[PDB]
Design an enzyme around this catalytic site. Structure first.
Site, PDB file in Angstrom:
ATOM      1  N   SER A 102       0.811  -1.225   0.000  1.00  0.00           N
ATOM      2  CA  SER A 102       0.000   0.000   0.000  1.00  0.00           C
ATOM      3  C   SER A 102       0.847   1.280   0.000  1.00  0.00           C
ATOM      4  O   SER A 102       1.582   1.507  -0.949  1.00  0.00           O
ATOM      5  CB  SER A 102      -1.116  -0.023   1.073  1.00  0.00           C
ATOM      6  OG  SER A 102      -0.728   0.510   2.326  1.00  0.00           O
ATOM      7  N   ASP A 129      -9.880  -3.490  -4.390  1.00  0.00           N
ATOM      8  CA  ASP A 129      -8.836  -2.586  -3.935  1.00  0.00           C
ATOM      9  C   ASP A 129      -8.715  -1.484  -4.984  1.00  0.00           C
ATOM     10  O   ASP A 129      -7.891  -1.562  -5.896  1.00  0.00           O
ATOM     11  CB  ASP A 129      -7.512  -3.337  -3.769  1.00  0.00           C
ATOM     12  CG  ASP A 129      -6.475  -2.534  -3.001  1.00  0.00           C
ATOM     13  OD1 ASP A 129      -6.754  -1.358  -2.677  1.00  0.00           O
ATOM     14  OD2 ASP A 129      -5.387  -3.080  -2.722  1.00  0.00           O
ATOM     15  N   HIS A 174      -8.484  -5.237   0.414  1.00  0.00           N
ATOM     16  CA  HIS A 174      -7.244  -4.472   0.505  1.00  0.00           C
ATOM     17  C   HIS A 174      -6.169  -5.258   1.253  1.00  0.00           C
ATOM     18  O   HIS A 174      -5.065  -4.763   1.460  1.00  0.00           O
ATOM     19  CB  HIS A 174      -7.489  -3.128   1.198  1.00  0.00           C
ATOM     20  CG  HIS A 174      -8.039  -3.264   2.583  1.00  0.00           C
ATOM     21  ND1 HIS A 174      -7.302  -2.976   3.710  1.00  0.00           N
ATOM     22  CD2 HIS A 174      -9.249  -3.683   3.024  1.00  0.00           C
ATOM     23  CE1 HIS A 174      -8.037  -3.195   4.785  1.00  0.00           C
ATOM     24  NE2 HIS A 174      -9.223  -3.628   4.397  1.00  0.00           N
TER      25      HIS A 174
END
Length: 252
Positions: free
Chosen positions: A81, A165, A239
């Site tokens: 991320s 995501d 995610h």
């Protein structure tokens, strides 16, 4: 010699050694890689970009250190991320360019891993062999400064991305939709109010809709990013990723 593994955590994990996808992974291959977790990195949900800049500076610093110390040591990088942005920035703008600070290490880079990558190259994705479908072919990273032509280099890359995501998988056609633009604004901003790079300055440049509407959406996006960063939820969200294929990747 023993190769180096550099890891950068995702949003909300300011502890290099703490629990989290890249560190968990490194811990599964310490028998074949030496491990240098990247610290001095707030991993902040907002403002994120200043957080990214600190992680980038530390990743560059550490790479130079370890790799100058052991000239026969190859290396790999892994980021999740916000961490994927850090690794992606270092790769694209510091390793690849012919005058990049780390360009001399290019021939020594063997493997890069991204999970949930806001700079994910268009149509470039791998499954994490889990409960989520790999990101579709017409999707890419939300950020305009994204990776390109990865397949053209000697190193190998794994970029694990799930549909759901969104920032890791925006549909190309949606790239300049309002909600998407404000999302990019939030990720790049120096703060909400302040200088030329604030959310508010960017909202003005964006235009399209009343400033108040943009302020509200930016706030809600920040509240949600924070919710993911610092909140106990389930372990089966889109995610999130299964790290094992990445482990079997590092292990070659």
């Amino acid at each position: 010699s023993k190769p180096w593994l550099f890891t950068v955590h995702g949003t909300g994990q300011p502890d290099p050694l703490g629990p989290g996808l890249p560190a968990d992974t490194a811990r599964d291959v310490l028998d074949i890689y030496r491990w240098q977790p990247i610290g001095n990195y707030p991993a902040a949900a907002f403002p994120m970009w200043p957080s990214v800049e600190k992680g980038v500076a530390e990743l560059i610093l550490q790479i130079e250190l370890k790799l100058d110390a052991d000239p026969y040591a190859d290396f790999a990088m892994a980021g999740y991320s916000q961490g994927a942005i850090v690794v992606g920035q270092v790769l694209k703008h510091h390793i690849l360019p012919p005058t990049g600070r780390l360009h001399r290490f290019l021939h020594r880079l063997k493997k890069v891993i991204f999970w949930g990558n806001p700079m994910r190259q268009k149509g470039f994705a791998h499954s994490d062999e889990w409960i989520h479908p790999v990101a579709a072919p017409d999707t890419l990273g939300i950020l305009e400064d994204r990776l390109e032509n990865l397949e053209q280099y000697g190193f190998e890359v794994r970029d694990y991305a799930h549909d759901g995501d969104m920032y890791a998988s925006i549909k190309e056609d949606d790239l300049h939709e309002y909600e998407v633009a404000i999302g990019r604004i939030v990720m790049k901003a120096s703060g909400f109010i302040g200088g030329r790079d604030s959310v508010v300055a960017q909202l003005i440049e964006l235009g399209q809709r009343p400033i108040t509407e943009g302020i509200a959406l930016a706030g809600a996006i920040i509240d949600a990013l924070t919710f993911f960063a610092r909140s106990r939820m389930g372990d089966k969200w889109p995610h999130l990723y299964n790290r094992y294929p990445a482990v079997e990747f590092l292990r070659q």
